[PDB]
Symmetry: C2
Subunit: 133 residues, 2 copies
Amino acid sequence: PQALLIKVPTEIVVKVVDDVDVAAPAVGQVGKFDDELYDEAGAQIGTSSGNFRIEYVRPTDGGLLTYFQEDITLSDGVIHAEGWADFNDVRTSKWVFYPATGVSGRYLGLTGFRQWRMTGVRKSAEARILLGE
Amino acid sequence: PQALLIKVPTEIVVKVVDDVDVAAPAVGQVGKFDDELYDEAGAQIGTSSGNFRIEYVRPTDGGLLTYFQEDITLSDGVIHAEGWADFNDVRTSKWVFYPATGVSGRYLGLTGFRQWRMTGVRKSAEARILLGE
């Protein structure tokens, strides 16, 4: 279109394999995730599969700067997303984001941002994908 | 509309005061800028005023991670934007981005991202603002 916002009020982590030290996350820890994405009516709209690696400690604030990559498969196309987030935000239920690129279907040509936040709820996040032409 | 894309084909730097070493930008350097934003027909659509500070070197790529803060005044509202960008990308004409928050007028309550790229033409850039409800 010109601009598209996909709201993902619930994103469930259906599989996570990682070596992240709970409470004490550190450089070199990695994770793989498979998620299911649901719209405002509770209908599954897609899945995502991605991974991450904690890469470095940001000296300004002690952030654990982590590099995420994922492919988000929706019913009418696929969106790649990758970039940086502070794992200290991840684990304190603060929003993180990184660039997103539509790679097929409806989303080809569109670019923007993938955003998500882990919520109070076990293995659950909320997310948003904002794209434009 | 639940999402909006504002395309800014030309953004001109009208005033800049900095101590950025053009040959070897470095940590601790700062700048202040004032810009003019133009639409596809060459009409001024707004201004931006902001500042930056080069904060640290990222080990993964030697990036000069820089913190930007600005207020973008458009004819129908104001958008705040701030966050991280690699000054090595700024100086090589690659896109940078950081979160944006509408703070008045048409943009009140909207949130998204500010994006810009120096074109390699004398202190001109191109930009995008992508916002969602």
